[PDB]
Scaffold this active site. Structure first.
Site, PDB file in Angstrom:
ATOM      1  N   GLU A 171       0.822  -1.203   0.000  1.00  0.00           N
ATOM      2  CA  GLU A 171       0.000   0.000   0.000  1.00  0.00           C
ATOM      3  C   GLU A 171       0.867   1.269   0.000  1.00  0.00           C
ATOM      4  OE1 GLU A 171      -3.740  -1.765  -0.190  1.00  0.00           O
ATOM      5  OE2 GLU A 171      -3.076   0.321  -0.365  1.00  0.00           O
ATOM      6  N   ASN A 188      -8.082   9.021  -5.555  1.00  0.00           N
ATOM      7  CA  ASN A 188      -8.975   8.116  -6.316  1.00  0.00           C
ATOM      8  C   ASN A 188      -9.916   8.922  -7.251  1.00  0.00           C
ATOM      9  OD1 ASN A 188      -7.860   5.829  -5.004  1.00  0.00           O
ATOM     10  ND2 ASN A 188      -8.909   6.600  -3.124  1.00  0.00           N
ATOM     11  N   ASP A 202     -13.635   7.822  -7.442  1.00  0.00           N
ATOM     12  CA  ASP A 202     -14.746   8.258  -6.533  1.00  0.00           C
ATOM     13  C   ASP A 202     -14.462   9.500  -5.710  1.00  0.00           C
ATOM     14  OD1 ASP A 202     -14.596   6.830  -3.406  1.00  0.00           O
ATOM     15  OD2 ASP A 202     -13.034   6.542  -4.886  1.00  0.00           O
ATOM     16  N   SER A 209     -11.949  10.582  -3.891  1.00  0.00           N
ATOM     17  CA  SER A 209     -11.508  10.290  -2.502  1.00  0.00           C
ATOM     18  C   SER A 209      -9.998  10.113  -2.474  1.00  0.00           C
ATOM     19  CB  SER A 209     -12.240   9.064  -1.900  1.00  0.00           C
ATOM     20  OG  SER A 209     -11.760   7.940  -2.612  1.00  0.00           O
ATOM     21  N   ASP A 247      -6.611   8.342  -0.212  1.00  0.00           N
ATOM     22  CA  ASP A 247      -6.064   7.335   0.709  1.00  0.00           C
ATOM     23  C   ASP A 247      -4.809   7.971   1.347  1.00  0.00           C
ATOM     24  OD1 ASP A 247      -7.921   5.471  -0.195  1.00  0.00           O
ATOM     25  OD2 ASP A 247      -6.509   5.209  -1.907  1.00  0.00           O
ATOM     26  N   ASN A 279      -8.782   5.319   3.464  1.00  0.00           N
ATOM     27  CA  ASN A 279      -9.656   6.182   2.689  1.00  0.00           C
ATOM     28  C   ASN A 279     -10.198   7.337   3.515  1.00  0.00           C
ATOM     29  OD1 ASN A 279     -11.130   6.194  -0.091  1.00  0.00           O
ATOM     30  ND2 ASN A 279     -12.692   6.809   1.345  1.00  0.00           N
TER      31      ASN A 279
END
Length: 130
Positions: A35, A46, A49, A51, A53, A60
């Site tokens: 990650e 992202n 959507d 958003s 992380d 998120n």
């Protein structure tokens, strides 16, 4: 902050991650590795959507921003998103522990499903004395 592997394995061990919700330490290490490459400052937008992380576990914004309307249905963390980028990972871990209880468990993170699931995770902790 970019953690050295054993340093992180020992920090995660001390914070109570080993076996948290039946999730092994090697699995948490594998996740952080794929990650964020163990970097606390890692952020990923992202486009799909709208958003973001954040940090070591790439949590998120739903959990730290908490989308102001039509909120899905998450176990929001008691912190602001910036708290997910600090050098001391305790807030981050507490939040990850919240995340994990959501209906997807660790399968919530794709990287884990692709790079860790059914794979040899042992390597991430070998020789760390954990």
């Amino acid at each position: 902050k970019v953690f050295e592997r054993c340093e992180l394995a020992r920090t995660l061990k001390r914070l109570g991650m080993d076996g948290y919700r039946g999730i092994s330490l090697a699995n948490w290490m594998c996740l952080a590795k794929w990650e964020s490459g163990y970097n606390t400052r890692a952020t990923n937008y992202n486009a799909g959507d709208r958003s973001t992380d954040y940090g070591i576990f790439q949590i998120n914004s739903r959990y730290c921003a908490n989308d102001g309307k039509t909120p899905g249905a998450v176990n929001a963390c008691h912190l602001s998103c910036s708290a997910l980028l600090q050098d001391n990972i305790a807030d981050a871990v507490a939040c990850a522990k919240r995340v994990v209880r959501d209906p997807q468990g660790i399968r919530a993170w794709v990287a884990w499903r692709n790079r860790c699931q059914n794979r040899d995770v042992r390597q991430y902790v070998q020789g760390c004395g954990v």
